[PDB]
Amino acid sequence: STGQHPARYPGAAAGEPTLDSWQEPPHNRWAFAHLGEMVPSAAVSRRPGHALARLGAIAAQLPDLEQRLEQTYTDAFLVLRGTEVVAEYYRAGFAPDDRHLLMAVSKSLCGTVVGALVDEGRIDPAQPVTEYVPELAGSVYDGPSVLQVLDMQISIDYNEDYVDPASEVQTHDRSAGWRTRRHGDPADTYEFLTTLRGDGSTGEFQYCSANTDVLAWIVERVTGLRYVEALSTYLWAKLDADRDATITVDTTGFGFAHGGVSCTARDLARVGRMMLDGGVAPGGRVVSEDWVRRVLAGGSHEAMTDKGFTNTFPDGSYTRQWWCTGNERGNVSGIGIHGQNLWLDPLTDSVIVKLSSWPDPDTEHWHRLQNGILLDVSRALDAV
Amino acid sequence: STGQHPARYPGAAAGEPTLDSWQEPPHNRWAFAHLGEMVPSAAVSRRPGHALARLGAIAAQLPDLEQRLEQTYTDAFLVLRGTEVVAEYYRAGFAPDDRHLLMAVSKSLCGTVVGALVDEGRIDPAQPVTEYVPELAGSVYDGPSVLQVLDMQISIDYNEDYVDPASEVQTHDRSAGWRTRRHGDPADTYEFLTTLRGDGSTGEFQYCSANTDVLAWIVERVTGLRYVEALSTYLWAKLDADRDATITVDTTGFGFAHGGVSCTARDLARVGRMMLDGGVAPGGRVVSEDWVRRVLAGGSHEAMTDKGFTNTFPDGSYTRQWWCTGNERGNVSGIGIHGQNLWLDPLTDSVIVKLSSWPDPDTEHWHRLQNGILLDVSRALDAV
C-alpha cells in the first residue's frame, strides 16, 4: 500500500472518482466542474496563421536568429530583461497566449514548491525521504535524504531512455497515463515509485524522473494538498500569471510533477523573474533568498559525471532540480526534452524562455544548436 | 470503414496521434500545445469557500429561492433579462467563471451549428443522412432525413438508460472515452454509430444521443472541420464569450457532441441571448431568423409521445435539438441530465441558465422541482 493521499475532492474515498464512477454521486458534483481531469478534452475557442517575430532589440546582433529558431523547432521564445519583454517569437499556429508542455522544466517548478516548504520549516532536506513517506521503505528511496532526491544523487535501476519501449521511463509513463497501460503495470504513480530499486549507493548524479515525483509525494504528505493544488498555492498563484497553468494527472489525480506542466512562455518567464528577484514574486515570497543563492551556486561538481552535460559545461553541476552550467556567466536552466528551457542569465538580469518540439527528445545535435542560441542571446544582452 | 474525418492537425494521418504516439514527430509539435486533448489534465490556478447569492431582483417574489436551488443541487444559476444579468447564484466551491458540464444542453449547441450550415446552404435538412455520410449506409441512419435526426424522429434500437450498465448509452460512453473500454467495443464514436439498427420506422419522437453525434459527423463532412473547430467557428467565437468552452474528445479527436461541452453559466446565457435576438450574436449572425422561429414554434405535437415530458407539458414537442414546452409562455429549453437547462422565456426577453448536479440523471422528482423553479422565476420576471 502507498498510504494516505489527498482526496480528489473533500470527502472523496481513496482513488475516487474513476473513469467509471465520475457520473455517480457524490463524485459528480466535483466531476461536472472538472471534467478535463477525467476525460481528454479540447478547447472551443472564443476567438475567431503566420509566425510572429518581434526580436528587434537583439535582431541587430543576431540577424539570422529567426532562422536559427526555426531550425530548432521553436514554438515559443521570449526574452525578459528585468521586468521588460524585449524579444518574442511564436511559430505559425501558436498564439502568444497558447500554453506549451514544459516536460522536465516542470521539475524546476516542483523543486521550487519543495523550497517553499523548506522555508516554512515543514521539510528538512537533511531528513530521509521515509520521514515523510514511510511507505517508500523497502525501495531505493529508503535511506537517501530529501536533498539527495532534490540533487538527483541516488543510484537507481531506472533506464531514463525516452525512445526505448522497454525502459522504466515508459513504464513510468504507462503508470501515470501518458501511454496506454499494459497488463501488470502499476495502478498509479505512487505504486510505480515503490517498485524502484538500486544498489544503495548515493552521491553521484543520476538524472531520474522518478525523483521529482517522490518530491511531489513528499509535498502532498507534508501539506495534505493535492500536488496540483500545492503547485498553485506555493508557486503559480503568487506569480500574477496571465493564465492558469495545467498539469496532467494520473488516475488518482496525482499531478505528473516530473514533466506534465503546460503554461504560456510569458508566464513561465515569471518563474525566472522570481528566481532573479531573490525568491520574491508579486504575490509574496515564494522561496528564501538562501534557496535561490544555493541554486545559483550549483551542486557538487564531482557528483556531475554526465559526459554529455560536462562536454559543453565542464564546470557544470545540478542542484534542487536545476541544471547549473558553471560557465563564466553563471547560467542556470530548467531543461525539458525536445527543447524546453527556462534559462537564467543573472549577469543581465534576464530570463530566456524557449519552448520547442524537436523531432528527437535528446541528442547532442539539438543541444549544441539550442545552447548556442541561448548563449548567443545572453551575450547579446550584455552592455556594449 | 467510416470514411474521411478531419485530421487532428494539418497533415495528420488517420487516427493520429494516439496516446502512444503523441510524443513522436510529427505529432508532437501539435500535441505539446494541446496535451489536454490526449491526457487528463488539471488546472493550476493563477488565483490564490461559501455560496454567492445575488438573487435580489426576484428575491422579493421568491423568498425561499436560494433554498430551492440548494435542494436541486444547483451549482450555477443565472438570469439574463435582455442584456442585463439580474440574478446569479453559485454554490460554495464553484466560482462565477468556473466551467460546468452541459450534458445534453450540448445537443442544442450542435443543432445551432447545423442551423448555421443550413443558412449557408451547405446542409439541406430534407436530404438523407447518407447524402453527407455515405458510410452510414446499412445502419438505422440509412433512409432518414437530416431533419428527422434533428427532430429525434427515428426509431432506433438504443436503450437511452443512463444507469443501466447494459444500455447502448454506456457502450456509446465507452466508445467515446467517457467510460473504460471493454474488449470488442467500437474503436471510436464513428464506428459505434455505424453499428446502430432500427425497425425502419420514423415520425415518432425517440430521444437518442446518437442522433446528435450523427449531426456532428455531418457537420465535419460538410465543412472539413473537426467538430471542435466547427463549434467554435459557427457558434462560440461569435458570442463574445468570456472564456473558451471545452468539449471532451474521443480517441480520434471527435468532440462528444451530444453531451460533452463545458462552459460558464454567463457564457451559456449568450447562446440564449442569440436565440432571443433572432439568431444574431455580437460577432455576427449565427443562424437565420427562420431557424429561430421554427425552434420557438415547436415540433409536431403528435410525434411527442414521451409521457414523461407531456405529463408536465401536454402540448409539448421537440425540434432541432431543443425541447419545446408548448406552455402558455412558449418556453423552450436545452436540457441535460442531472439538472442542466438553457431555458428561454421570450415573453420577458429572458434567458435562465441552471447548471446542477442532481444525484440521479433523470427522475420525475427532480424534473418536477427543477421545472417548478424555472417557471416560477420566469413568472417573477413578468411586468406587474
Ligand SMILES: NCCCCCC(=O)NCCCCCC(=O)O
Ligand atoms: N516521462 C516523460 C518524459 C519526462 C521528461 C524528461 C525530460 O524532460 N528530461 C530532460 C533531460 C535534460 C537533459 C539535458 C542535458 O543532458 O544536457
Ligand SMILES: NCCCCCC(=O)NCCCCCC(=O)O
Ligand atoms: N452519454 C452520456 C450522457 C448523455 C447526456 C444525456 C442527456 O443529458 N439527456 C437529457 C435528457 C432530457 C430529458 C428531459 C425530459 O424528459 O423532460
